[PDB]
Amino acid sequence: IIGGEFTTIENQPWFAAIYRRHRGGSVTYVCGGSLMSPCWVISATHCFIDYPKKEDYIVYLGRSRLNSNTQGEMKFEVENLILHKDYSADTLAHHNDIALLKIRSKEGRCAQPSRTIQTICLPSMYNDPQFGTSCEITGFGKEASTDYLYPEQLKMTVVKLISHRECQQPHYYGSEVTTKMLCAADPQWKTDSCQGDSGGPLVCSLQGRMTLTGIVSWGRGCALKDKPGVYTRVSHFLPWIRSHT
């Protein structure tokens, strides 16, 4: 996250950290995710497309730090890895960039509710907040695009939703953004999501709840002017999610 504040999982108790193992001895962070229900985490397909070997990923819940432990964390394995079929990566965009991971702990259970582990709400069919709404994003991604390492402490920031009309302006992203995406930016282009934040949540308040409105998907640079962050529009994938829950 560029800008933002450092935080603790208690402030984002539905955030999931996904890592990959290289038996060599290291586990490296891959992307973030969000807890939908006790056994299901939702993230972005582009995070797994290149190494779709479920057996090599680990998911953690209740984690405030990237490589150190947090008391209250839960470790899980990926029982099912559902990538979207018709996922496409072009020059910038990722289409149908949503993925589901069914998790299981070494004891055989799914997540248990704690002050650091909670689920996030899903929107209703094609229901979104209106542009202007402030939403928050959270993650362990880069703090500057020139960094080659990720922060050890979790971060969060607030961004606002902008219209497609504004995001599809020729000098923003043109028609690379579709109705199945949402764009969110900082009025003063100071904070934003970046590389390492993919998969994590864009949460906004809808109908009085905190809902997962989008999934961090792509963007040109990080916190650049006229280059908003693009998120997968969860509200338009409800059927897809449902057939696998």
């Binding site: 208690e10 402030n11 108790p13 539905w14 229900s37 006790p38 509710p113 002050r115 909670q118 689920t119 996030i120 709400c121 899903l122 709840r209 905190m210 809902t211």
Partner: peptide
């Protein structure tokens, strides 16, 4: 105990 999506406290 049980989940309540969206609730932080």
């Amino acid at each position: 105990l049980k989940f309540q999506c969206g609730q932080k406290t």
